Enzyme design. Structure first.
Site, PDB file in Angstrom:
ATOM      1  N   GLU A 178       0.861  -1.179   0.000  1.00 23.23           N
ATOM      2  CA  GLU A 178       0.000   0.000   0.000  1.00 23.23           C
ATOM      3  C   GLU A 178       0.899   1.231   0.000  1.00 23.23           C
ATOM      4  OE1 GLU A 178      -0.877   2.575   2.201  1.00 23.23           O
ATOM      5  OE2 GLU A 178      -2.563   3.186   0.973  1.00 23.23           O
ATOM      6  N   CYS A 232      -3.336   8.688   4.369  1.00 24.91           N
ATOM      7  CA  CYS A 232      -3.082   8.094   3.062  1.00 24.91           C
ATOM      8  C   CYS A 232      -4.166   8.439   2.052  1.00 24.91           C
ATOM      9  CB  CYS A 232      -2.952   6.577   3.200  1.00 24.91           C
ATOM     10  SG  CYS A 232      -4.379   5.765   3.962  1.00 24.91           S
TER      11      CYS A 232
END
Lengths: 678, 678, 60
Positions: A255, A294
């Site tokens: 990720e 994020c």
């Protein structure tokens, strides 16, 4: 005060080259972190030999109950976590989202597990697949726990949410976990790990923690382990070509950094509510936790005409944000986690400016002060489709770039130019615009929210990953997938197709399957308590001959006079060729054949699951039912008062006098237990 | 005669260093293979600029129809394929397996797609997830096609099944494919691609073919492409760290060599039929197409006592296999594909012997003959748990190693010592043995069959992967997954969570969802034809007051005298506290309220999907129904005779007089269309 | 038994009713022709029903 790491069952530390954890606001080094000289292979062997079999011996229900107990215990002690989160530069609201969202993830996975996982150590995921004509050969898919250990390498953003959103499906899947947080914020992860360990709620070896470097832990992994990574793309891609990890086919999920967009639809004018909620949304996603999420918005895509008004509104609402030490009243946005992050964000902003971006607000930060503060920054890109740096460069802080679009399709192309993102937002009131945007740009986004006036009153946000929805994205965003409900549980499990006879498949599944041996008992199955019932307990009812009078009486009582039952002329010209019995009457009369009337263990019915009407039933046919106990699932008592029940699914087969099946379906019931478990 | 490559829409070839395709039986070089100087970047750009949007404009129903048409056209011309398969060293039955299994995979995926995929270009995979209290904010998951091209790098074992196995889900997912077969057998793949292309049944640019080397194709891929690899583990692990593939997060799944086992259960004795079918199974898997399938049995694990009897029986049955030119009448097993393959098999056998294996049947081949023949080879391993090479070395031929076990659990450990396999077989008659074997050894196997007497009658085989079942395994087997039904279709799509208001989600989905805007007409929805129906067309029915008379009449007509309806004393101490109405009567009365009686477009009901009973209905309560059209799916006319119908799913919501829902469910329905599509 | 019946309902005659006041709801009287047929389309019953029907606009 060197930070300890919990492995092989003991709290210990390392000795060598260290790293320091500073205070984000004051700047003082208040922790030292190192793990050199720790036996990583011993820690893996400890997690595998005693943590993993202990977790695998529990049924899914027991593991979900353990998740719930851990969530309760962590919730009771959240003040310690808030006090530690204050050291990282977070206001009360950001610490709230981190702490409470991590614990809420535990609670959500506990609920999903209790509600839809089997009361077993194996998980039969689909229904039985027939692979023959006489029924001797069939298949179904099973999930069993992998036997290794799960290594979760987390990033500094969410030291508690980032650990628990991975930990919950890891345990639900039956695997131990070795957690390696980011050095810059490991003090908050350590305390939560210590809380979980000192609770006594989880098995021994079910949780390990590495503060500092992982050493050569990845060199000791084998093909039953899994690795997850969150952080910079360079570090992740380096881990992805780990020689051991590639040689053993070890699953690896990454990720990375993404450039999340937020598009303003052409249909909105500045005098509409959508415009105001768009401004508020962009500002909130820009400023919460100083934009260190994020999923924080990085590119703002607006129609060419709206650009000036949008920029005015953004700078106006964005200048009203007070940055400072959140312990002071009037502060709304704290600091980055350390001066290193501040330098990184500044050099990214400098790259964006060197590549053709104008300052609309606050480009430079105090690169000498003690606290790691950054001012909210809003950039402008005048040539969006020929400036390729604005689609590749991510300043990891309160920084976003406004850019213009055209004809509602250039905006779609600009949104897709990100190269793969975690989250995107479209503010629109027109549903057709939202359809076009999805069909064109879902393939580059992991999550997309259509934000109109109606959704805005309870919407959870652009940057908040909910436990029920996947969290990930293609390309630049790493390629992985997290948090998709039980989709995440399946990443710690092996899927296996099992072929054989139905009877073997039933014994393996611990659930009865179609065509498998049954057991008849001369005691009606509805008179057995939960514990006495076994899958495959079966009853053949007596027969009932259908008549024209039944068609008439049911049509009358229910009010359904569909021509296929009540009109001889129209029925003659139908596919059946004459009048047939109502399907719902076949259902009701079947219940009348198998239901036991008197008071007993069966408490409720409440549910029918997959009903297909196969063959038509005519007046003159005689029907008969087989009722087989198919699946049992115990329900945990939520108190000491509630009476202990379990769920029983029953297969029902309705046959005519040629032994031809005319109806197939399952019913759900609540059945009482003889022994509660408080 | 040089083998051409079909890229950028033209049949072309390369110039430079080539590979030769020799006849497996005679040895003559009958093809030359090279692709040097071909513009790979042009080929990929050709696939994505015109193949991909052409496939994406088709609904899943249309792509399924295209798969079925292609399967038919391929099946008609199968003789040419059989003739080219003769050149590879295959008997008629092996070529039947390859050819007919590939075409059957196409047929199966056409069927699955037409039966359970939406009539749209987007795929909503799950039901709506509520995320709010008032119902303003929800989410569901959508699957949309990726934009790139899928590169399938196939092995030589199955030149026809190995291509269509991957091609069917690739097209059904909406992605163009670039096929790269193994050079040693590319002549059979080229012919099938020729058939597909000169059929005119697929869009332009929907299939490319690279005969020979891939050049720099992997360097030109981006995040929207996917890669698959079947073959040697070293080549695949080299592809996995391809720098462009790792920099862009391109999905990459690998299938490698696996040591498939076959255990004999502790329960069986030589006097049982299980023993005979175990022998027959091991021999068939050892000798089918010279043991060149990835699922061929390589490790035979029997109890220590049965070792000598099993070794007698295998040798006896296995000497009866005549190896030779299959065009000769009397041959049961042909050759390998190459003298190179024969050398590789021989050197693997020599490694196994050097590592402590006993010869039981012939293990030396003719390393000078023209044909690439290998004799059936059966090895013996005396000390299985201390010679590690027997669990790591795989001779890709008619070679298998017999080995002893103990105490029923040493055998499970031996099965798991392979390090991850594609397929395993357990021959037993005791279901408890089978449950233990599954629970312990499924985590290292992708597919497992329990082989008893009942399943032996119609069992498709140990080595035949069916298109409904996953095909893969962990560790040494590469870690990938194929062929799992629609599971494989989802590998060429992107999964995206979409949050918003139910009305927006209904627009995006092209399906009505709970809470979304409806539209009423003054015309009953059951009077509309398929084409006139729209998701969200809705009808509020009149009301029906429930009375005690209704409870009595329904219990009498149906026969269900359950105490919660008919016994006021027992109902007094139920959860409800008084007599309630039968749930099935709520269902039937609802049907009575909304069903239109007269002849119309609605033809059949036949289905009820997800029925929950939320709240009890009492005498004195009044019910009312809202019937909403939820989802429409057109059915392709399978002739010019049958009447064109479509499938409509209807949402049913039953309310009491407080507007509280008391029942929610969906009904399926066949609805007549105005215009067929022949 | 075995015969199938079908009905035609036809509006035969309308008669407006004057409102007694400004309060009472404005209704009118409608007579309906009813014709019941069997499957040979021969009539088996003929009759009229009377009915009170609400008006959209009263005349006080």
């Amino acid at each position: 005060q060197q930070l300890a790491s919990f492995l092989s069952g003991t709290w210990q530390s390392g000795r060598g080259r260290s790293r320091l954890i500073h205070h984000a606001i004051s700047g003082e080094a208040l922790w030292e972190v190192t793990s050199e000289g720790l036996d990583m292979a011993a820690a893996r062997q400890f997690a595998i030999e005693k943590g993993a079999p202990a977790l695998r011996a529990m049924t899914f229900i027991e593991r979900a109950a353990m998740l719930k107990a851990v969530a309760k215990h962590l919730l009771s002690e959240k003040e310690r976590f808030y006090a530690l989160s204050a050291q990282t530069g977070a206001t009360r609201a950001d610490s709230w989202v981190d702490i409470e969202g991590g614990i809420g993830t535990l609670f959500t996975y506990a609920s999903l597990g209790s509600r839809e996982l089997p009361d077993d150590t194996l998980w039969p995921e689909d229904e039985l697949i027939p692979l023959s004509k006489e029924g001797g050969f069939a298949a179904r898919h099973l999930l069993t726990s992998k036997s290794g250990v799960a290594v979760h390498i987390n990033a500094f953003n969410f030291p508690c949410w980032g650990m628990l959103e991975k930990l919950a499906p890891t345990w639900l899947g039956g695997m131990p976990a070795i957690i390696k947080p980011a050095t810059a914020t490991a003090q908050l992860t350590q305390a939560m790990v210590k809380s979980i360990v000192d609770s006594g709620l989880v098995p021994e070896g079910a949780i390990s923690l590495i503060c500092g470097s992982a050493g050569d832990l990845l060199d000791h992994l084998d093909s039953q382990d899994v690795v997850t990574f969150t952080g910079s793309a360079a570090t992740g891609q380096m881990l992805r070509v780990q020689p051991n990890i590639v040689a053993k086919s070890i699953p690896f999920t990454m990720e990375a950094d993404s450039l999340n967009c937020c598009v303003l639809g052409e249909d909105v004018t500045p005098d509409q509510p959508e415009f105001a909620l768009f401004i508020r949304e962009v500002v909130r996603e820009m400023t919460t936790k100083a934009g260190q999420k994020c999923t924080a918005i990085r590119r703002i895509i607006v129609p060419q005409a709206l650009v000036n008004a949008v920029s005015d509104a953004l700078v106006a609402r964005l200048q009203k944000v007070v940055v400072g030490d959140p312990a002071q009243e009037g502060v709304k946005m704290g600091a980055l986690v350390n001066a290193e992050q501040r330098a990184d964000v500044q050099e990214k902003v400098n790259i964006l400016l060197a590549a053709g971006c104008e300052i609309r607000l606050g480009g430079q930060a105090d690169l000498s002060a003690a606290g790691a503060f950054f001012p909210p920054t809003l950039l402008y890109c005048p040539q969006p489709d020929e400036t390729p740096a604005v689609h590749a460069t991510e300043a990891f802080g309160p920084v976003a770039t406004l850019m213009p679009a055209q004809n509602q399709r250039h905006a779609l192309q600009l949104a897709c130019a990100g190269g793969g993102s975690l989250a995107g937002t479209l503010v629109t009131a027109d549903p057709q615009i939202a359809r076009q945007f999805i069909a064109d740009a879902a393939r580059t986004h992991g999550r997309i929210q259509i934000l109109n006036e109606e959704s805005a009153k309870e919407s959870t946000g652009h940057g908040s990953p909910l436990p029920q929805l996947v969290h990930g994205g293609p390309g630049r965003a790493g390629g992985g997938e997290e948090l998709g409900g039980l989709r995440a549980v399946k990443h710690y499990m092996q899927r296996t197709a099992v072929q054989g006879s139905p009877t073997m498949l039933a014994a393996i599944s611990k659930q009865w399957v179609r065509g498998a041996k049954v057991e008849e008992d001369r005691i009606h199955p509805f008179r057995k308590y939960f514990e006495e019932l076994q899958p495959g307990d079966s009853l053949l009812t007596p027969r009932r001959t259908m008549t024209e009078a039944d068609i008439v009486n049911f049509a009358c009582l229910s009010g359904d006079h569909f021509y296929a039952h009540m009109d001889k002329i129209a029925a003659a010209e139908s596919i059946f060729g004459e009048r047939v019995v109502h399907g719902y009457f076949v259902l009701s009369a079947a219940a009348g054949l198998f239901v036991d009337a008197g008071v007993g263990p069966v408490i409720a019915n409440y549910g029918l699951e997959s009903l297909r009407f196969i063959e038509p039933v005519k007046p003159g046919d005689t029907i008969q039912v087989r009722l087989t106990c198919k699946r049992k699932t115990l329900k945990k008592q939520r108190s000491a008062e509630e009476k202990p029940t379990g769920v029983v699914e029953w297969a029902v087969e309705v046959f005519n006098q040629h032994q031809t099946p005319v109806a197939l379906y399952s019913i759900l019931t609540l059945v009482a237990r003889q022994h509660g478990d408080f």
